[PDB]
Write a protein that binds this ligand. Structure first.
Ligand SMILES: [K+]
Ligand SMILES: [K+]
Ligand SMILES: [K+]
Ligand SMILES: [K+]
Ligand SMILES: [Mg+2]
Ligand SMILES: [Mg+2]
Ligand SMILES: [Mg+2]
Ligand SMILES: [Mg+2]
Ligand SMILES: [Mg+2]
Ligand SMILES: [Mg+2]
Ligand SMILES: [Mg+2]
Ligand SMILES: [Mg+2]
Ligand SMILES: [Mg+2]
Ligand SMILES: [Mg+2]
Ligand SMILES: [Mg+2]
Ligand SMILES: [Mg+2]
Ligand SMILES: [Mg+2]
Ligand SMILES: [Mg+2]
Ligand SMILES: [Mg+2]
Ligand SMILES: [Mg+2]
Ligand SMILES: [Mg+2]
Ligand SMILES: [Mg+2]
Ligand SMILES: [Mg+2]
Ligand SMILES: [Mg+2]
Ligand SMILES: [Mg+2]
Ligand SMILES: [Mg+2]
Ligand SMILES: [Mg+2]
Ligand SMILES: [Mg+2]
Ligand SMILES: [Mg+2]
Ligand SMILES: [Mg+2]
Ligand SMILES: [Mg+2]
Ligand SMILES: [Mg+2]
Ligand SMILES: [Mg+2]
Ligand SMILES: [Mg+2]
Ligand SMILES: [Mg+2]
Ligand SMILES: [Mg+2]
Lengths: 106, 46, 387, 49
RNA sequence: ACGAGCUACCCAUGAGCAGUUUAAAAGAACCAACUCAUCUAUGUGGCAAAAUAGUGAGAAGACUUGUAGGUAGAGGUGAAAA
RNA sequence: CUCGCACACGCUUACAUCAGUAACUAAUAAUAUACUGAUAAUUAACAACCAAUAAACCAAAACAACACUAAAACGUUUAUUAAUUACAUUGUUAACCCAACACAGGAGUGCACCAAGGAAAGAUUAAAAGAAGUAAAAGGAACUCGGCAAACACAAACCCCGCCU
């Protein structure tokens, strides 16, 4: 199963091949970690509104950017917004990103 | 509606229709080369 | 009871050169009357005449000397003069920074395994490019606690930068427009590896009217001998984002030299002094396009000049050898009819190339230079003045 | 060399060596302005960089 | 024997249609680019072996158009004008 | 007064510097993008040249959120191979091409309508006839095959033949 493999019953086949149980909704640890106002960036509403506009309209000289341009930009822009919380939580420096690694599990 | 300019130049078309390669691919074409060589033409084909 | 003499300006519809100047001065006044900065850029860049295409990463034997003439830039050896301010200096633990940078080197070199490479030549373009992505991200996050500005800044990864300007004049040699005067137009299409943009402008290094004894070199040949080739396409002035973006200023740039400009390639081509030329040529062209684009997004142009100097920083690197540059833009009226009397000049301080690591092998970095790391930290600690 | 038949190259062939070159070079004065380091030559058609 | 570089039709591969009116990109409507050529006047060894000036019809379609290929005279092709 | 810059296709040095034109070329003269002689030139980043097999994948382009009928150009990833070795070769001029002409004709795309490109009159006199344009007393189709043409008009209705584009 590589990246470009399509499954017909995507939720059902993945559940069967992995022997998992689907639970609707994010876990309570994750969900209660975002409802607290003490875990919000400054101007969260405004900056995200700028991130969406920058991703889809501002980042390119053309009037209508194509999807392959604004799909990785919007994700990286949102990563930077939550990366700025390292000053409030000085433990995010333990993270690092990797690109196009080779993974295998049989 | 104003005839006289029927010749629109094109190198791709000229070398594909009257080229040396085409002249040697058909048995009738080779006879055209033979006639022009016998007559003494300076240019057998394009 | 007072005579009212008509003005003595030249005619507007005549064929004479004085009339043509008045026609030119007519559209010059159209830009002034425009309100939105977008409309000013539209009028300046709506004509599509022939222009030279300037590549920041070039193989010309003497590129920095020619690029200075096109830009009116005087290159100063060494780092820019110190701010001479000893306000409370941050305390940074080098061990944490050293470990973070070493982890970036060890990952993309030894730890992170790639797909099998049949050539086995191990192209440095495919290895150093992900290293720069992690190095910028690692240092921006780590230094965010000491510099709050980097938290609010935006990171751009391989985003094009464009600039367009006129310089000097030329008499057309050949064609039906023979003998008529036509200005020389230049274009820079740059793709910086990384960018940091700030809502607030960085402070200046030297005052706007800074008199330097050295002069801009003047070539005695056509630009076609560089070589440079004329081309015609859209004239674009770009900062990495459209004008509506609130982040209209820049902080630093990161550039990666391509495969064709490696140190090993230059040695085989019998090129010794060309190693530093490539670094200098890349910084002068890239930084000027960035600083020039910032000025024109604020409404400043050839007839409005520049009120406050625009400062941007650059870090040209190839994968192992790092160079640091600082650029300050004082002049924007580079047009021949507008540069008749302009004593101001653009200054670009530069640094000699220095290695960062040495013979990294088996998750062990043998050699390491902290001064390069310390210099990189100093660049990322630059902050706008607060009020 | 010009007007000669080069050996066809396959994998592992020996280095190609020419001992008496058939090429001849003219050094000419440039007709336009040239930089200080540029020298202009006239070379036969079968000569590469 | 030689000709589909003009033209009739078709197979590939591309590229154009702004504004205005309407739930409409409806072989709808107003009007340009663009494509045809209704009427009259000049022209008639002429600018032109079929044009110029004014005026006209279509202008999101059965539409115009570039490149290149296919069908050849007892034939090709044709929304038949021999 | 306003069809301007560039690419593709085509043409093939007709381009540039200097000199000469009694005569040849321009439908004339000055003169030289167009005639003669000598010398010189277009430098690659743009453009051409620029891997094969096996496997997974029913889900349109129209700001594409989602739909219509006429059912639609536009590929990624995994696997097995792929000489690995600075600098290869080729197109870069022009006022140009197809029409016997330096022809009021024909000619695809991008961006502007201008900052760019150009000159309707060789010099006179101010006859007829002819062509093109503007204005008019009173009348307003009495002209004529027909309101053809022209107009400060730019509307209304009937009939014949085809349904309509
Ligand atoms: K054919
Ligand atoms: K004509
Ligand atoms: K020619
Ligand atoms: K009658
Ligand atoms: Mg003929
Ligand atoms: Mg044709
Ligand atoms: Mg055809
Ligand atoms: Mg329309
Ligand atoms: Mg219609
Ligand atoms: Mg007409
Ligand atoms: Mg007419
Ligand atoms: Mg009339
Ligand atoms: Mg109509
Ligand atoms: Mg109609
Ligand atoms: Mg045949
Ligand atoms: Mg028949
Ligand atoms: Mg028909
Ligand atoms: Mg009949
Ligand atoms: Mg009949
Ligand atoms: Mg000819
Ligand atoms: Mg003449
Ligand atoms: Mg002369
Ligand atoms: Mg000559
Ligand atoms: Mg004639
Ligand atoms: Mg005249
Ligand atoms: Mg006359
Ligand atoms: Mg008369
Ligand atoms: Mg009248
Ligand atoms: Mg009257
Ligand atoms: Mg009557
Ligand atoms: Mg009568
Ligand atoms: Mg009649
Ligand atoms: Mg009428
Ligand atoms: Mg009747
Ligand atoms: Mg009918
Ligand atoms: Mg009927």
């Amino acid at each position: 199963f590589h990246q470009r493999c399509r499954l017909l019953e995507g939720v059902k086949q993945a559940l069967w091949l992995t022997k998992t149980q689907l639970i609707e909704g994010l876990p309570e640890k994750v969900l209660r970690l975002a409802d607290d106002p003490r875990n919000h960036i400054e101007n969260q509403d405004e900056r995200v509104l700028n991130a969406i506009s920058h991703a889809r309209l501002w980042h390119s000289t053309e009037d209508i950017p194509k999807r392959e341009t604004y799909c990785p930009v919007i994700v990286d822009s949102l990563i930077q917004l939550c990366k700025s919380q390292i000053l409030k939580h000085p433990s995010l420096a333990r993270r690092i990103c990797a690109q196009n690694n080779t993974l295998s599990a049989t | 509606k104003a005839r006289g300019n029927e010749y629109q130049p094109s190198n791709i078309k000229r070398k594909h229709k009257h080229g040396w390669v085409r002249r040697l691919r058909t048995p009738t074409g080779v006879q055209v080369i033979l006639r022009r060589m016998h007559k003494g033409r300076k240019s057998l084909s394009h | 009871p007072v005579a009212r003499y008509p003005p003595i300006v030249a005619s507007l519809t005549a064929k004479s050169k004085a009339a043509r100047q008045r026609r030119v001065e007519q559209w010059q006044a159209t830009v002034h009357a425009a309100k939105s900065v977008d409309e000013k850029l539209r009028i300046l860049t709506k004509m599509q005449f022939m222009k030279y295409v300037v590549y920041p990463q070039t193989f010309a034997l003497n590129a920095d000397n020619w690029y200075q003439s096109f830009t009116k830039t005087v290159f100063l050896s060494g780092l820019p003069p110190t701010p001479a301010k000893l306000e409370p200096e941050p305390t940074l633990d080098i061990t944490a920074l050293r470990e973070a940078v070493c982890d970036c080197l060890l990952q993309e070199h030894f730890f992170l395994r790639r797909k099998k490479r049949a050539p086995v030549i191990q192209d440095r373009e495919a290895i150093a490019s992900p290293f720069l992505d992690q190095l910028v991200a690692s240092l921006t996050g780590l230094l965010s606690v000491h510099n709050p500005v980097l938290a609010a800044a935006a990171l751009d990864c391989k985003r094009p930068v464009h600039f367009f300007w006129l310089r000097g004049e030329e008499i057309i040699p050949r064609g039906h427009r023979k003998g008529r005067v036509d200005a020389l137009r230049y274009q820079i299409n740059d793709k910086p590896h990384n960018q940091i943009r700030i809502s607030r402008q960085l402070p200046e290094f030297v005052p706007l009217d800074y008199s330097i004894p050295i002069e801009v070199p003047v070539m005695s040949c056509k630009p076609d001998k560089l070589p440079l080739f004329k081309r015609q396409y859209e004239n674009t002035i770009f900062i990495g984002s459209k004008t509506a973006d609130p982040l209209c200023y820049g902080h630093t740039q990161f550039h990666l030299l391509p495969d064709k400009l490696k140190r090993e390639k230059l040695l085989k081509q019998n090129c010794a002094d060309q190693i530093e030329v490539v670094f200098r040529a890349n910084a002068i062209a890239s930084l000027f396009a960035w600083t020039g684009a910032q000025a024109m997004y604020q409404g400043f142009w050839s007839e409005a000049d520049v009120t406050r100097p625009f400062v941007s920083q650059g870090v040209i690197t190839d994968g192992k050898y790092f160079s640091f540059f600082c650029y300050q833009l004082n002049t924007l009226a580079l047009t021949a009819q507008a540069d008749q009397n302009n004593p101001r000049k653009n200054i670009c301080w530069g640094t000699q190339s220095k290695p960062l690591y040495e013979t990294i092998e088996d998750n062990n970095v043998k050699g390491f230079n902290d001064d390069v790391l310390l210099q990189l930290v100093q660049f990322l600690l630059n902050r706008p003045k607060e009020d | 060399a010009r007007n000669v038949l080069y050996p066809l190259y396959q994998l592992g062939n020996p280095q190609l060596r020419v001992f008496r070159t058939n090429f001849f070079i003219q050094l000419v004065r440039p007709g336009t302005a040239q930089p200080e380091d540029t020298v202009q030559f006239r070379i036969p058609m079968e000569m590469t960089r």
